[PDB]
Every structure is written in C-alpha cells, then in structure tokens.
Subunit: 108 residues, 4 copies
C-alpha cells in the first residue's frame, strides 16, 4: 500500500504522457507520429495504464495480473517511441512505468 500508491501514481503519470502526447503533439505533427502501429501503441498503452490504475485503486483481485500486462504494454509502447524524433521522453516514461508495474506485480 506504499509500493501500491507508487504504481498508481506511475501508471497515472504514464497515462497522462501517452494520451496527452498522442492527442496533442503527435496529432498536431502528423507524419510518422500518426502512423497506425505507433499511434495505436500509444492509445493502447494509455488505456492500459489508466485501467491498471483503476483496478489497483479498487484493490481488485486481478490488479497484480493486470499490472503484469501493463508492463508489457509499456515496454511495447517504449519500443514504438524509440524511433521517433521528440518521443524519447515518452519512451523513457514508458520504461519507467514498466519497471514499476513489474515491481508491484511481484509483491503481495
């Protein structure tokens, strides 16, 4: 319930990063920033992180498993953000969240 508020805070920060970037910077730049695979990864990751926050906040039985999946979502989205100019901060945030997701998924 300390590593927990940590994972919640991290997943909400990452939700903000990925959803906020997609719908502002990426949408406004166009080009590679809105190519299906990259953009879908961003929206997918943002929803996973927001859904993970929710499941943790209600102390769901499946919170630990959901965060395990959120770690994969975060990792996949980091890879898709590495190639792009301006997306290196997002990719770092996603890798940071992925670590947090993995830590709390392995505690009880």
């Amino acid at each position: 319930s300390k590593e927990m508020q940590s994972c919640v805070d991290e997943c909400l920060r990452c939700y903000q990063m990925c959803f906020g970037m997609a719908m502002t910077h990426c949408l406004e730049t166009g080009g590679d920033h809105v190519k299906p695979k990259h953009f879908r990864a961003m929206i997918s990751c943002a929803e996973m992180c927001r859904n993970a926050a929710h499941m943790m906040l209600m102390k769901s039985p499946q919170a630990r498993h959901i965060c395990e999946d959120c770690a994969e979502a975060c990792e996949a989205c980091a890879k898709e953000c590495d190639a792009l100019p301006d997306m290196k901060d997002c990719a770092a945030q996603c890798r940071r969240c992925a670590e947090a997701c993995r830590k709390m998924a392995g505690q009880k």
Copy 2:
C-alpha cells in the same frame, strides 16, 4: 427507464462507432481522416458517449445534464464527419444519438 435503456444503448452504439472508426478506418486511411480537428472531434465524441452511458447506468444526479452535453458533442462530431468519404454512417449514427440524448435529457 425505457427511454433510459434507449439512451444507454444509443450512446454505447455511438461510442463503438466513433472510437472503432477512429482507431481502425480513420487511422488506417490517414489524410483527412487524421486531421486534428476531425480526429479530436471523433475521440471527444466517443468519450462523451461512453461517459454518458456510465453516468446514466449509475443513475447519477448529473446524467440528464451530461446527456445534454453529449447531444452537442454528437451534433458537432456529425458535422465533422459529413465531408469525409466512408464517414456517412458515422455521421448518421451521431445525429441519431444526438436525438436520443435530447429526448432523455428532457424527461424524468
């Protein structure tokens, strides 16, 4: 509670239309389909319709007001979808939902 299940069904259908089209057809086509104003309208409308469904399902005090706003979101999004090839079904759905939103917002 009949006009109610109607508004819920309509807003969920419209959520599916706008969010599903944005993230599949629009994202895959590119061009006009991902221009910021049009795309933002689609994502905005989808979330409004999904949020309206939620507030109705929990019999929120603000459900009637939220649907009033959802009607405007739906109308605005219909206008943004009129110009675009393959978006005519979406635009019709948005106008249909806007009507449903307006009916239930004016009853008890």
Copy 3:
C-alpha cells in the same frame, strides 16, 4: 471480426449488467448486496468488461490476452452472484460473457 463483434457486444452488455446492477439494485437493497467481496467483484468485473471492449475496438495487440483475463473476471463474478436470488440474471450474463471471452481469446 465476427466472433470479435460478438465479444464486444457481450462485454458491453455485461458491463451494463454488472455496473448498472451494482449502482442501482445492489446499492438500493444493501445487506449482502453491498458486502465488500461481492460488490468489489461486481465493479471489478464491470471495469474488466468495459476495458476489454475498448481494447478490442482499437484492435490492440493485447486484446486476446485481456479477454482471457476478462473470462476469469466474469467467472469469478458469476460465482459471487450465485448466492443471491435477485442476481441470477447477472450471474447468467457473466457466464455467457465468459464463454464469449474464451472463444475470441482463442482465435
């Protein structure tokens, strides 16, 4: 994307059932209807089903896995709804969704 529109429709129906029942019938009845384990199962299942719908609608890479988990959520919530006579429709809906979740997760 036929078994897919099926899973979407089912998960949205089940979201409606579990969230709508929790916040209306269960909240209004009280008693066993708002006991933590039962109620948390309901809210948890509702969010899983709505999250699953979303991930499927955007053709997320992880949609198959998420639905696998949604099947377990639905099954667990069905068990928690069995003991109350007024929750029999909810429990059936959850078992129906769990089947749909399992079909599409294996495609």
Copy 4:
C-alpha cells in the same frame, strides 16, 4: 499551459481520493458509507473527475464546460462527505478540486 496541468493533476488526485475511498474504506466500513446517495455521489464525482482529466488532456473543445460541471460534482460530493467520520480529507480534496475546476473553466 500551467493552470491546465494544474486542473488535470487536481482532477486525477480527486479521482484517486473518491474512487479509492469508496472502494476501500467506505465499502469496508459499510453503514452510512454505503448509503445510496452518499456512495453514488462518490462514484459519480470520481468518474466526473476522471472524465474531465481525459477531455482536458485531449484539448477537447468542451473541456471548459465539462470542468464547470466537474466543479458542481466536486461541491455536491464534498457536502455528502462532510457528515461522515473519516471522510474529512476526501471532502477537503473535493473542495480543492472544485476550486481548480472553476479557475480553469474561466480561463
């Protein structure tokens, strides 16, 4: 901008407070904490705050109006949390968010 990231941060904090309290402390205590009007206000307010954050993050045209409504949700939920033991922090947070909502709705 600045007052914007402020409203987002505040609405997400308030979402955390109201949803996390409802589903933990309130659900676990029962009694007044799960009476329909109070509990519905908490869930409603949490969703309003989370929905407002979303609409702001995507720079929706309707973000200003939505936050206006979130301010009312926050105020109403604060009133419903004032009476209850252990809900004093929640009520303060709701009043704080309501102010933030009102600032950005007017800028």
